[PDB]
Amino acid sequence: GNLKSRDWKMAIKRCSNVAVGVGGKSKKFGEGNFRWAIRMANVSTGREPGDIPETLDQLRLVICDLQERREKFGSSKEIDMAIVTLKVFAVAGLLNMTVSTAAAAENMYSQMGLDTRP
């Protein structure tokens, strides 16, 4: 999958369905934020910025390595967001899931055993 217009427009068409959320109110996830995350995440894993993989192996691989760097780097709403987004991207993307909030998706992603909990 090399930036397939299908898997792309599709995964993104369903990914946006996710909610940004904050803690009490609601919100809709846009391509702008979804990009800053998926992009920042890919780069964090020594990979290209516009890395749009279409395999649980690639998505999970990034979420794993990224998580490791996040801890070693410490706490930060920035790194935290990029991570949560990565999980929702693989689910709402590869699985074309339409989770309500990014948090709900991430929780399920790991709840199933797709995101290692080191």
Q: Tokens 């992603």 sit at which residue?
A: 109
Amino acid at 7: D
- Helical ranges in the chain per DSSP H: 5-15, 31-44, 56-73, 77-94, 102-111
The total number of structural domains in the chain stands at 1
Q: Which residues contact 20 (CB under 8 A, 6 or more apart)?
A: 26, 27, 28, 29, 33, 101, 102
Range of the domain at 47: 1-118
Residue 78, both tokens: 């920035």
Distance CA 114, CA 85 (A): 14
> Are 93 and 15 in contact, with CB atoms under 8 Å apart?
yes
24 CB-side CA count, 13 A: 0
Buried b (16+ CB within 10 A) or exposed e, 9-22: eebbebbbbbbbbe
Dihedrals phi, psi of 19, to nearest 5 degrees: -105, 135
